[PDB]
Amino acid sequence: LDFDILTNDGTHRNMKLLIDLKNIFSRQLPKMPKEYIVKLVFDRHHESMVILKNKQKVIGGICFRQYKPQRFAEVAFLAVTANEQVRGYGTRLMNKFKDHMQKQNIEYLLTYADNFAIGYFKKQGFTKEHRMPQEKWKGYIKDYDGGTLMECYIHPYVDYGR
């Protein structure tokens, strides 16, 4: 059970892993246009950390986009394949993700949430109240009135993950 950064380098191996992950995302996020998931997942700004089982099978992952200069990242998609849910994989992925972001010198994680997802992210350390200056993401992250923008502060020396 590895949590690796999946690079989109145009190779058969990684492309197959990204597609498998994109398919997990669509199946688990039905309200999302499948072609939209494909666009972000393979674009020049996004990255994916996957949960690899037996170093070959993808069972989940998280797609994100770093805004390095500003020191914050946005979570695009997060999911675990149905038959592997409720086994703690998703929580371990998020902890691994926070650790990696800490090492990438990222100070804040931002994510839009709706309905259940709001409560889900609160348990993962995200809050509705932001401590990060609004004008920092404004102009970089689209501002939708219909969603709840949540943020997780990543302290330079708090130990995330296990």
């Binding site: 309200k31 999302m32 972000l40 986009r65 997060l78 309905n115 992250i141």
Partner: peptide
């Protein structure tokens, strides 16, 4: 631009 595909139904 990205948006925030982090969009799950209600569950």
């Amino acid at each position: 631009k990205s948006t925030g595909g982090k969009a799950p139904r209600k569950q």
